[PDB]
Amino acid sequence: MYQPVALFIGLRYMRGRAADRFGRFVSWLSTIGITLGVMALVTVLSVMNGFERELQNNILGLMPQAILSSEHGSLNPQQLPETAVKLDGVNRVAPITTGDVVLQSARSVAVGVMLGIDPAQKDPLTPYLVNVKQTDLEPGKYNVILGEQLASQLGVNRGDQIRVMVPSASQFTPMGRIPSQRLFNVIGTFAANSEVDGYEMLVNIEDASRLMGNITGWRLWLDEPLKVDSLSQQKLPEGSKWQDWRDRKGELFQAVRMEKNMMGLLLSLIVAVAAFNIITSLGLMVMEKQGEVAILQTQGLTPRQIMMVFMVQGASAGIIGAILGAALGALLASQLNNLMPIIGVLLDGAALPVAIEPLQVIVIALVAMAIALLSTLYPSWRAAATQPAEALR
Amino acid sequence: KILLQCDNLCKRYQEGSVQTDVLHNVSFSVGEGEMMAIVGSSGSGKSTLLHLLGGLDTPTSGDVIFNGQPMSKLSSAAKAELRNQKLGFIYQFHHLLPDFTALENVAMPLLIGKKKPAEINSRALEMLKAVGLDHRANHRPSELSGGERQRVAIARALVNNPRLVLADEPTGNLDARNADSIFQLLGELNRLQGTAFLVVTHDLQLAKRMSRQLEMRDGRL
Amino acid sequence: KILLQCDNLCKRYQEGSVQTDVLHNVSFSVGEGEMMAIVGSSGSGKSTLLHLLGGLDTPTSGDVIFNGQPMSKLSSAAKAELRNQKLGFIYQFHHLLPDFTALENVAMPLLIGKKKPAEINSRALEMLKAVGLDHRANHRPSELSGGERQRVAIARALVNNPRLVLADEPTGNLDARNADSIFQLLGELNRLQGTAFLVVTHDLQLAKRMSRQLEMRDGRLTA
């Protein structure tokens, strides 16, 4: 659209240079100086947003928020119908049974907690089932679903008899106090991609052997997996309590958001030191290019116009090298396992993920460009004082 | 009539940490349609004299005038308006821009004044063809010969159509065949509009120009 | 007897980005007690020939020998061992160290060869007083005159008692009084031992010499 290009003088000074001269050498040292900082900085930025990618998708996207309990013990379903449970933010209800149990077999021991459901309803939290049918959950055979990682340390495959025991929620015998021993066979295993221990078993709600057949409470799901503080002190009926929430899992939702604010805002001194290499690159062109300033001072050049030549030339050197750090940052996007060979230290688990965000490019290119406009002031002022009488004719 | 009036420009500064008497009491007067060809020597301060008349340094002894505009009233930004419009500067110390092309170098004084881009390109084309260099317009001055890039610097000061062209020895860096041809290009400017040119001389190569040859050896007539 | 035998000296490189035969087949011989005075012009081939005889570069045409040791059997580190034991270099434009004093400039080859530090400072004092410069020991070479900073460079190569002193025309910024008086000092090196020296001549200063006043026009020896 025929833009008024007034930066044509500074673009030719940084393009038409030789290779054997010493002025082209220091410009390369500066270019690879910013590229080191920007790239090593976007590598930390990629692995910090990768922790947000791994969380709330398959690690923190299957945990519940709040459960319903009572004070008199269990809950009678015929007095609390489905038309009376109306809360703010809830969308689905399901009965559930609680109680801490312990595994008492002839091989090893394990501690876990059951999860009572019905074959008519399906849980929307953990749909990852390794050939587990939600319909085949009849309580007449006393079946249970065992996790994959709990069955590996126990060494029991599907189709075997495993005895369970509960210390607390057993049969309240009027004469004594006996432990509830129930034969809960495993006919199928499942894996829910749990980096947590994950010792949850799946039982049926029709089990009149734990306590008193009634249930303990209902499930209250919520479509806000980040915070529950906006819907905590709401209207609640009589006979309901408040339980724990997302405050005890991995990283506590604190070690990523605080570290990103410390690396993005407080750690902005990388480009402040890297701007001094631009002053070295723009400070050597007043010695090998003394004659061109003498030509641009005698034919009617104002002192205001000569300040706008080295400022754009100092900003043109800050663009190249900073965009190379964004180009090398995209090179590590497809690097998942090949970038880290075996030098002994491996650190298995969820150590180094990758996540490229498009909104993190403008925040890292604006700080690397605006700090070069205020830095190029001392080489821009000392070149205007060079009169064409003592240096060159 | 009168363009520049030198009134005792004694340049007294630390020329190499010593006070020299090379530029002492220089005072002459150039006309408008006519001019002056100062015959000097190598070391008398011919290049030093044209720097003081153009407005590059201050002598702190006297003051000159330019059609009723003295240099005491001209600031640093006001001298840039005088050097760009009505002052031509021809030099001889390889004063070209090798980064730009030969077309942009002639158009460079017009690019400072920020005129219409149609009249910048057309004025540089007719000035390059006056010295016979329109076929080398889009060419770098680094690959040009010595008898070709010198004529670009001569045509670099005639695009603004000045009144006093302080030429610092334009003849001597090129051959004998093109020395006579560029004498008419300075002579045709007297016929169209009357552009004066104060040329310095130390090998007596401007002896046949006019009658006014003042021998100012070390500022002494 | 013999020190350095020249066989097929054709230094062929891009001399001014062209390939010219200015230094082609320069074959001569220096003696243990005998010296040579090569006569030529200002900067024709004397600047290149003095660089090749000390071991600064390879001509890739032939080879030179030094007391039975040729340059072809010397590596990059082994060639530096010959330029310090029995070799000297004198130049024209006062090739000294300007950031150091005149006392430490004399004992510069003594500090590289890892010698005893007691005899390093004593040898620098007797070499400074040999040219009449012991009173200007703790001084800078930059603040000296023209004929003062030249005489300290001639007493720098002969400190470690070499066998061949490659002097590249020591006549120069020094005056006419210290022009012939320095020649008897270089003559004193060959009167007590077998320290030869190669001097080149441009404006016929070294015509009063021993026997070998031959001219060399572009690698071709004449009368």
Binding site: F22, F25, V26, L29, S30, I32, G33, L36, G37, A40, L41, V44, L252, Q254, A255, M258, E259, M262, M263, L267, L269, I270, A272, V273, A274, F276, N277, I279, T280, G283, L284, M287 | - | S47, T48, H51, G54, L56, D57, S76, A77, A80, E81, L82, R83, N84, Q85, L87, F89, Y91, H95, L96, L97, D99, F100, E104, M108, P109, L111, I112, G113
Partner: protein, 409 residues
């Protein structure tokens, strides 16, 4: 005695002006801008650690043991068992009282507790945090209550009146409790750091046995943990005072905000704040390549005297160490004179902008301390010489392949 091995390093870059000296000014203050932040920025994180264990973790207790509606009658066998347990200071009681205050249109949880005044100098620092010169008014029998600072400016409970607060106690029925008038005059006021100034009140032992309406006993026994800086093995052994069931309540649970983010910031500063020294090492490369173009004739003198090839490369190695030592020496001096008097600096620039920021509403403290330790100063001087050795390897190899036949020697 000194050790002068090669003297061709201190008197090698001796300059008196020009273009080589212009790079050495920017290379000095360029690396000094890095070291200045690693001193005044790490002293603020080291100052946050000493303000917690000495000021915050001094008056707060560690572990409490409660019961589910049962008075702790067996306080004699629980007292004798804890006498020979390692990591104790004293045996202080701890009673709880819920509260609902409706006065002056305010809703705040007033938490009260009882601490024996005989054992108070070896558990916390009570007499050092006092306003009056005479602190001899904290005895029993006179019924003298004391309040904090957070409630005095809004609830008109300043010293001089008779503060009577309606508090709910334990009862067999679950209804609205009695509004008993507390006839306890106030005398004296404590002072905290703006965190425990609205839920901190002290009651006498002979006076607290008439407001609970349960019995002449104590419902909870507290304990003091003398082991500091970690609580891992000091909470597993303190679980047999009660029955087989446990009641976990530690100081790391309710105060999990601090003492974790302080060590996490300094852990990144051992790998991210050292990154700016590697970028600052590129200025050492740009100032060592300019000492070759002007001293090109100086190396040609040494090559004619028969110098070792490893000796010429060893000149620019020690030349880059001396250029990196002088640029890093000024960064420590500018960091000491700021971190020692940081509190007049943060109050001088805040009053010039007009409205002040960084208040105390979500944050913990309005101002910041600065503790200068001799541990982080040594970590900067190690990496300033190791990273400069990698940066000076390339000018030491570029200036070694220069032949004297090319230069006019």
């Amino acid at each position: 005695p000194l050790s002068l091995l090669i003297g061709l390093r201190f008197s090698r870059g001796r300059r008196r002006g020009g273009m080589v000296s212009l790079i050495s000014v920017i290379s000095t203050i360029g690396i000094a801008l890095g070291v200045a932040v690693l001193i005044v920025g790490l002293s603020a994180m080291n100052g946050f650690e000493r303000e917690l264990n000495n000021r915050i973790l001094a008056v707060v207790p560690h572990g409490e043991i409660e019961a589910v509606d049962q008075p702790w009658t067996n306080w004699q066998e629980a007292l004798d068992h804890v006498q020979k347990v390692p990591g104790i200071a004293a045996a202080a009681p701890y009673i709880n009282f819920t509260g609902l205050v409706e006065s002056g249109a305010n809703l705040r949880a007033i938490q009260v507790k009882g601490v024996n005044p005989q054992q108070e100098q070896r558990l916390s620092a009570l007499p050092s945090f006092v306003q009056g010169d005479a602190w001899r008014n904290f005895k029993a029998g006179e019924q003298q209550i004391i309040i904090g600072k957070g409630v005095a400016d809004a609830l008109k409970v300043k010293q001089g009146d008779w503060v009577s607060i309606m508090i709910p106690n334990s009862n067999p029925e679950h209804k609205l409790m009695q509004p008993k008038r507390v006839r306890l005059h106030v005398a004296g006021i404590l002072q905290l750091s703006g965190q425990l100034d609205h839920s901190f009140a002290m009651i006498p032992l002979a006076d607290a046995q008439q407001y609970l309406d349960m019995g002449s006993s104590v419902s909870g026994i507290a304990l003091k943990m003398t082991d500091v800086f970690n609580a891992n093995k000091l909470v597993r052994d303190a679980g047999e005072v009660t029955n087989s069931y446990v009641y976990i309540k530690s100081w790391i649970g309710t105060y999990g905000y601090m003492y974790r983010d302080i060590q996490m910031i300094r852990a990144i500063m051992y790998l991210a704040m050292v990154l700016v020294i590697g970028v600052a090492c590129f200025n050492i490369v740009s100032t060592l390549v300019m000492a070759v173009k002007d001293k090109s004739g100086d190396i040609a003198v040494l090559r004619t005297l028969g110098a070792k090839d490893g000796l010429i490369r060893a000149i620019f190695v020690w030349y880059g160490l001396l250029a990196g030592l002088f640029g890093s020496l000024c960064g420590v001096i500018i960091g000491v004179v700021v971190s020692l008097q940081l509190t007049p600096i943060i109050e001088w620039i805040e009053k010039l902008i007009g409205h002040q920021f960084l208040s105390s509403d979500i944050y913990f403290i309005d101002f910041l301390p600065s503790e200068l330790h001799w541990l982080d100063v040594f970590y900067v001087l190690v990496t300033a010489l190791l990273l400069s050795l990698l940066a000076s390897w390339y000018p030491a190899r570029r200036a070694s392949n220069i032949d004297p036949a090319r230069v006019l020697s």
